[PDB]
Subunit: 102 residues, 4 copies
């Protein structure tokens, strides 16, 4: 039942490009690295990993998932300051691209 | 006595319009879209279903509520990336409207 | 040992005023209401209520507490969208006023 | 394997300076003061104390950790309103900083 959101969401507003949404490319790399780490550091599954990853840069909210080891705890601190930005502008450009599509 | 909030709130300052507080229009569809999905997929009640939908763009804070199923995990990201921007500009406009309302 | 911050921060940086930090008045007024509701509606203590109030618009996070009544659940939903923008601007003005203090 | 994030990230683009990244200074002093407080009041390990201290500026989400004493609740409100804007402006400057590196 998500077909409306996936196709008319974070695939629709992608096909709308200036140069400083090279930030969605930067997000991709910090989010995927983060996902790669959380799977391996924290033992979690991919989806749970990508969930927690995105959860530290948006208001969204980690479920049960949160770090348990010093390594991932510190990593989350370092990553948390880097991704906070990339999300913010991707949310903004993505948001206007909704209203420009109406 | 939630009245003075809902009435001197979402109703009162929600009627200060440019062309671009048609964001509220874009929002209402996206919160609604999410609420239908959460009710049906996650099986939650409408209010709790809405509670989670409004949670993923705002610092409000999701309850015990988090997605338990893969679709509800996946969908929560795609929705969460788009709405977070929609939530903000609307939240700014209303806040802007409270200050010039005294 | 917080006597340092309360004087050095919370009551430091407010003693600096433009036109727009009329926004503190409105934020002040929104939070007092919200707290009163929770103590009265949701039975919690003044701080636990006052903490949840501040939890919803800033990212800090509520620990244990989450509203349990359908009534208080909506109250937070409505109250959430109003207060967030006031949080932004008082939080932003106040932070710049630290940097102009170094 | 966080080395790739730590060196390629929260120091590699941390050292990209205008006048207005004097906030990173102000962040370091306030983030430190909090961590000291949280270590002392809340009994927590320094790491966890730093994990909560950052959790409240950023979208991260504290773990199962949260202020359980009244002082530490009283403290967190005052500190969250001060430190949130600093996390914000640094998050952008750091964000602009990854994109300027392409
Ligand atoms: Ca949050
Ligand atoms: Ca989160
Ligand atoms: Ca949370
Ligand atoms: Ca939230
Ligand atoms: Ca919060
Ligand atoms: Ca947070």
């Amino acid at each position: 039942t998500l077909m409306f959101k996936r196709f008319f969401g974070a695939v629709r507003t992608s096909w709308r490009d200036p140069s400083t949404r090279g930030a969605v490319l930067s997000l991709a790399i910090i989010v995927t690295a983060a996902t790669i780490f959380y799977t391996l550091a924290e033992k979690w599954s991919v989806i749970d990993s990508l969930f927690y990853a995105v959860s530290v840069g948006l208001p969204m909210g980690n479920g049960p998932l949160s770090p348990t080891l010093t390594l991932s705890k510190i990593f989350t601190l370092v990553y948390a300051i880097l991704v906070v930005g990339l999300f913010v502008t991707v949310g903004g450009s993505l948001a206007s691209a909704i209203v420009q599509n109406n």
